[PDB]
């Protein structure tokens, strides 16, 4: 659980040296985007339910995982999805603010693909839901902010694959 400042301090500390010009050079780069990330995390908090409603209706709403036999049939199983998609849109918001994807594999990625295989959850439909959820997130926060929030979505999709 490290942000961009924590990761910069760790690498500069792990060699026992002070924060030289290169370490502060990245820190200044993070502070420049500090204004963009909060507004990105602002609108995502507002439209959390709307984004997840848009992703599932655009990716896996009417596919036969939704029908009987599919992986999402029963109401408990459907309700687990939007609960499950809420974490991906939420933890991706944390990575967008912290500027470092360490929180994702610390709290989301580890034991995740090994868990879906146990339950039999289709990893293929899961990533496309996150990809569609990444597509709507670029709608709200804009282009570059969508590039930032989108940079952690595919990090989840990559490791979850």
């Amino acid at each position: 659980m490290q942000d961009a400042i924590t990761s910069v301090i760790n690498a500069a500390d792990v060699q026992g040296k002070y924060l030289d010009a290169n370490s502060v050079e990245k820190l200044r780069g993070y502070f420049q985007t500090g204004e963009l990330r909060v507004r990105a995390a602002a609108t995502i908090a507002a439209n959390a339910a709307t984004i997840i409603k848009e992703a599932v209706a655009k990716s896996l709403l009417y596919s036969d995982i939704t029908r009987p036999g599919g992986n999402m049939y029963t109401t408990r199983r459907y309700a687990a999805c939007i609960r499950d998609l809420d974490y991906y849109l939420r933890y991706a918001t944390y990575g967008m603010l912290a500027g470092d994807p360490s929180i994702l594999d610390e709290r989301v990625l580890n034991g995740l693909k090994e868990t879906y295989n146990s339950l039999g959850v289709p990893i293929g439909a899961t990533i496309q839901a996150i990809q569609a959820m990444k597509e709507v997130t670029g709608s709200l926060v804009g282009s570059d902010a969508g590039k930032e929030m989108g940079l952690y979505f595919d990090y989840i999709c990559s490791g979850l694959s």
């Binding site: 760790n10 690498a11 500390d13 792990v14 060699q15 026992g16």
Partner: peptide, 8 residues
């Protein structure tokens, strides 16, 4: 008693 090196 020294810094670890990059090995945490």
């Amino acid at each position: 008693l020294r810094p670890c090196g990059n090995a945490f």
